[PDB]
């Protein structure tokens, strides 16, 4: 008896660094402590090719980007760079034990938080 911590399409990177290209995905963040992710929603629903990251040893981070705060805390900051105009990229990778890495993209920014809160929020739990 689990509850769904956040599930929906996600975005996966298909191609190289130079040349990005995200497909759409199906994520499903269980309170199991279990991160799955399917090619898409008839893999979800019919249940085809849907990977599962174990969340005991799992870490979440941007793709080699500042932290993700547009809201700002308020507060003299280490860089508070970017003024004008903002990137407002919002991408979380999920890190197995066997370097198995999760990239995907939110395609909600609000989703992006809950998701990369689900992931730690699950290891929290395995944790303790």
Same mark, same amino acid.
């Given at each position: 008896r689990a509850i769904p911590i956040k599930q929906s399409f996600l975005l996966k990177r298909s191609g190289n660094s130079l040349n990005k #290209?995200?497909?759409?995905?199906? /994520? !499903? &963040?269980?309170?199991? *402590?279990? &991160?799955?992710?399917?090619? =898409?929603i008839n893999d979800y629903i019919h249940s085809t090719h849907?990977?599962?990251?174990? &969340? &005991?040893? !799992? !870490?979440? @981070?941007? $793709?080699? @980007?500042? $932290?993700?705060?547009? %809201? =700002?805390?308020?507060?003299?900051?280490?860089?508070?760079?970017? *003024?004008q105009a903002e990137e407002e990229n919002f991408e979380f990778l999920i890190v197995s034990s066997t370097g198995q890495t999760w990239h995907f993209?939110?395609?909600?920014?609000? #989703?992006?938080?809950?998701? /990369?809160?689900? %992931?730690e929020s699950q290891i929290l739990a395995s944790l303790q």
């Amino acid at each position: 008896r689990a509850i769904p911590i956040k599930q929906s399409f996600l975005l996966k990177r298909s191609g190289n660094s130079l040349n990005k #290209e995200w497909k759409k995905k199906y /994520v !499903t &963040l269980s309170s199991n *402590g279990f &991160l799955l992710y399917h090619p =898409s929603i008839n893999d979800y629903i019919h249940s085809t090719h849907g990977k599962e990251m174990d &969340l &005991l040893r !799992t !870490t979440v @981070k941007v $793709p080699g @980007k500042r $932290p993700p705060r547009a %809201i =700002s805390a308020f507060g003299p900051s280490a860089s508070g760079s970017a *003024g004008q105009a903002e990137e407002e990229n919002f991408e979380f990778l999920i890190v197995s034990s066997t370097g198995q890495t999760w990239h995907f993209e939110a395609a909600s920014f609000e #989703e992006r938080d809950a998701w /990369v809160q689900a %992931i730690e929020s699950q290891i929290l739990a395995s944790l303790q």
